[PDB]
Amino acid sequence: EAAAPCHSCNLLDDSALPFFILTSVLGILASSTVLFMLFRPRWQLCPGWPVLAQLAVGSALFSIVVPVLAPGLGSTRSSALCSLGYCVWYGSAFAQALLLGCHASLGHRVPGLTLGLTVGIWGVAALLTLPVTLASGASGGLCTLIYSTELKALQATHTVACLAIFVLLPLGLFGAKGPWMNILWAWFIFWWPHGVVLGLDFLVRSKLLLLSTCLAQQALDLLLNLAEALAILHCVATPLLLALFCHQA
Amino acid sequence: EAAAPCHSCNLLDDSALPFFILTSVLGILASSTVLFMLFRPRWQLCPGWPVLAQLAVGSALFSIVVPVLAPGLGSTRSSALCSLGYCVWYGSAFAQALLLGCHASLGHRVPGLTLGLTVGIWGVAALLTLPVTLASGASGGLCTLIYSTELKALQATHTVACLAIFVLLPLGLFGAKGPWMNILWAWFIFWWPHGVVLGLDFLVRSKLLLLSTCLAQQALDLLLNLAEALAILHCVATPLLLALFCHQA
Amino acid sequence: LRCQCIKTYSKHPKFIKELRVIESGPHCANTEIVKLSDGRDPKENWVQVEKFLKRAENS
Amino acid sequence: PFHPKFIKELRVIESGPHCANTEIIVKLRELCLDENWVQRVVEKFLKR
Amino acid sequence: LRCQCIKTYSKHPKFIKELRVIESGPHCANTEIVKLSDGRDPKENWVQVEKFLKRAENS
Amino acid sequence: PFHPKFIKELRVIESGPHCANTEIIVKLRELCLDENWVQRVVEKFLKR
Structure with missing residues (x-):
């Protein structure tokens, strides 16, 4: 009458590439496109342009790293590999969050205002x-x-x-x-x-x-x-x- | 009797390349050599190897930037150019100092011990x-x-x-x-x-x-x-x- | 993610066939599944398994 | 004879009709087990 | 590096020929050179320059 | 007629024998100066 069984690996177990590796490759393609379009200039008129360029570069790093931590790839992953993947993943997330924040506080607003920030x-x-x-x-x-x-x-x-x-x-x-x-x-x-x-x-x-x-x-x-x-x-x-x-x- | 004429621009005014650009180029060459020797392996047995690799990469960045801030190069330098040069210069100095200190405190001593540090x-x-x-x-x-x-x-x-x-x-x-x-x-x-x-x-x-x-x-x-x-x-x-x-x- | 069986219940000893051992874990944050005859803790007196192991003590 | 330390999870199955032997499962390479060194780990590993 | 003439001392007004104007600066950190006849401050009475400018007031 | 704001340093030389004119040097492009707009800056720039 009082049993306690249940277990789950929900919606992400082994479907793999149909959702992540294809997503990762398409993301690296799109991020390289939007990164090399700024490096190959109407597209050089962004207010606070390098903040947005770094927002794109963070997405590029995240796209490059998604397959490292994604399921369905090669097993026996080195602990260093997963550590590096999580580090760059959450670091890109933090940087895109944190640059978003500074841009939301310093939008309208020294030569070092771009590099220092x-x-x-x-x-x-x-x-x-x-x-x-x-x-x-x-x-x-x-x-x-x-x-x-x-x-x-x-x-x-x-x-x-x-x-x-x-x-x-x-x-x-x-x-x-x-x-x-x-x-x-x-x-x-x-x-x-x-x-x-x-x-x-x-x-x-x-x-x-x-x-x-x-x-x-x-x-x-x-x-x-x-x-x-x-x-x-x-x-x-x-x-x-x-x-x-x-x-x- | 009471005069105050006194001025100097000592030992570094316009001699330029004999001292800096030659030094900068030789430094970028040596740093690329010692960087591209670790990436092409007895040279993979360094204890705390990535700390030293970053200590060499900082020297490579410093060598690449020395001619930017050195005298004798092109005048009318953009304030952003000097700001970036100083940024990477003193940042490489700080990073090498901090890596040396951390290695002197964590020499003998988790997968993140290399990437986290x-x-x-x-x-x-x-x-x-x-x-x-x-x-x-x-x-x-x-x-x-x-x-x-x-x-x-x-x-x-x-x-x-x-x-x-x-x-x-x-x-x-x-x-x-x-x-x-x-x-x-x-x-x-x-x-x-x-x-x-x-x-x-x-x-x-x-x-x-x-x-x-x-x-x-x-x-x-x-x-x-x-x-x-x-x-x-x-x-x-x-x-x-x-x-x-x-x-x- | 994490260990399971968090519905630990106080009430058969003769209707036990299947079990598993999972105590700690990198994501496990609890202490712990057992199957009845028809399909359904070290602190407990009769539960503390060892005696059930003695029912299969050839190995 | 091999390392007994990095074995993480254990399981035991009673020898019912379909199970001709008392199958116990240990997973960290999950291999079925039904010796002088077979029982040399069990008690400490359960305590470990 | 920085402005100069930090040996400001008491003291000819008729033996003044050359000067320069440097007040502030990114590295300049004090307030200020003058050449005598043979070659050698707004608060001062006769130093406060403007009168010497009137000695060349055509421009 | 040009911008009078970004001039940083100034100098003045009395018209002695080798100097046929009272040369005043202003440097930020350092060009010698010996008009209605020549004196239009001097006092404020000295105050600036």
């Missing part, structure tokens, strides 16, 4: 991905984030940083009470599900939440995999949005 | 060069650091950071009271004159020092230019030291 933004993006690359690995052959008491502090830091920058940073901007069009808010619309689901999974793993039935666990895994897919689609998503931004001025 | 070290190096690239420019056609009341705070932050990482960081390590051979201390031997002379010029320009005669000003300018030359020679200096480090294990 971009060097500070990566540096802080590269620092914010310290926990995820430190708390990373591939147990059993699949890229997996490390969530255990052995790495409890690093995982806690990683999840609070991801939550802040992905759902509290846009919500924090939402507390601003006009020059608030933000036609690039679709990026944080893409990334907020991932942040909130990461926070919910952090609460559930720490056993500090109210998951009452196995339906809760099934929905948690389903939303986890859905968030992974919707985040991975950003690599092909961004270049069209950057073309829109270039054509919006 | 290197990503944190650049990020902090890229953050430490924020003041110098922000307080930079080319007034009159020559790459010049900005030291005035208009940029007083940025220059103050820049000089305290440079002083710390260049003379107080090695002095701070000198307070450690054996695994302390540090056959790469010649790098900080190279860079300490620059830091102390920068601190002295900070004191002299802001006028909290005891410079008595035009001998003091003449020696200050002479030591300034000598420090610039001795710092610029690091680009050709490091690769031989890295070969020594590879052959010392």
